[PDB]
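Extended Data, record Ligase Cp1B
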Amino acid sequence: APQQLQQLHVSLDGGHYEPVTTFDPAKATYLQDQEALQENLLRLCSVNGWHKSSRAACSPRPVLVSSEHQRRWRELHEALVLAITDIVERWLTDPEARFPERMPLEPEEEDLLRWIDEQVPHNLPQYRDCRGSWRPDFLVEEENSDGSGPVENFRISEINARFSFNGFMFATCGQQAIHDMGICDNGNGLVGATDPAKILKGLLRLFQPGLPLHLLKGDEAGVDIHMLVDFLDRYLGITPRFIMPADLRLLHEPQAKGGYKLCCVVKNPDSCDPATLIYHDGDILEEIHQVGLELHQREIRALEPEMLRQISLRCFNDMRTILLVHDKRMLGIVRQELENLVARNVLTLSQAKILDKGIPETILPGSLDLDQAIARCKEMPELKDEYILKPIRGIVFGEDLNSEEWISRLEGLRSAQLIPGGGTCIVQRKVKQLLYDVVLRPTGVKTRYPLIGTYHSINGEFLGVGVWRSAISHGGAWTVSVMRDE
Ligand SMILES: Nc1ncnc2c1ncn2[C@@H]1O[C@H](CO)[C@@H](O)[C@H]1O
């Protein structure tokens, strides 16, 4: 039988580890374990950059992952990158595929994508070269393997790709802490399942640290972004400038990228090189060479169209990542494309089967799938319990609704268009998650919860499994990963 995911207790004075299912806690020291952990989490990120909430929700009891789990995650990722990259590069250039009619975006967004296609490859790369930061989330279900036993299966529920940093600094800080504490890598039979240097170095590849960095953020409060800015300040002497949409300016310029100078207002002008400043129309400006985006889709839509094109030439993530890869419907498009992706030699046959096992069944609005769904549920009302309704741009379970209201919702999804200024739903099969023995808080309360996983990609490269959750922002306990030393 394959080694399962499990949470370990690890003695901080000697390193002896034991599964939580089995550990007799009669003489545990959870409170002092918690304080040691929280001190250590201040190493890469000061109290300035942390939310005290999030630093306190961390658990010194890591999740044990196996080398099979790692091979599984890396393989799913390789197939995912290949499929989604091919789809994105084909979005408007393979018209017979009808992608914008199968997954409609807002019209000013589809205008933006079409402008971007006109810039490739001389002003913007082909998409394979600028995929940026993606962070998929996965759930864990059971599957009858051949192996004649139960094996853990990972289903990607969503790809987080409009922001570039969320999750990255938590994994970096947490893996570095349990290492500094000796939980792993210190001779007790455990090693860290993710290298924090690998993760952080991926982030550093999103931008050139030689040039000044701007971070454009509006209504979003931010979490990992402030931990990165803390680490850059204290360890590298890099100080990115946060700017808001209203701070942006354009100046006419022949000899410049896209015939304009993208600028922003400067709030702290005394601390700047006076030779970097422009006094224009009552504004004190500095120029923007590279900008990281932490904006909502509506905020992006609210930019003046020329302002929006000038951001696209200078921004990470690329607008194709933010608008296409982040959208939950793209998981539906990948499933539609599997047979076509093997016909084009984009996926091997087994890679298509890996993807089909790694993405839950997803029905898109305006699809024939959604039509046969409505028919199948009219002939089998018990079916609605097996599915859910996730929003794109608040999940809704079919077992929590009457059959009359369920066919109603589905009947309203027969067009693929988006509600003006809003979105739509996808219909996804409910994943039956495994339950795990866990001790998440220093209270010592053993419970039996599911595990929510995530992993980190930069420019298509798998960087490591991310933190385990059982959202950290809404209070959730979290931890990181170890492997047997064998
Ligand atoms: N396909 C799915 N089946 C069941 N729950 C889901 C699914 N997609 C998202 N979720 C919910 O969203 C959370 C993670 O986004 C899960 O823990 C679960 O509550």
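Summary. Residues 137, 139, 157-158, 360, 388, 390, 395, 428-431, 452 surround adenosine (CB under 6 Å).
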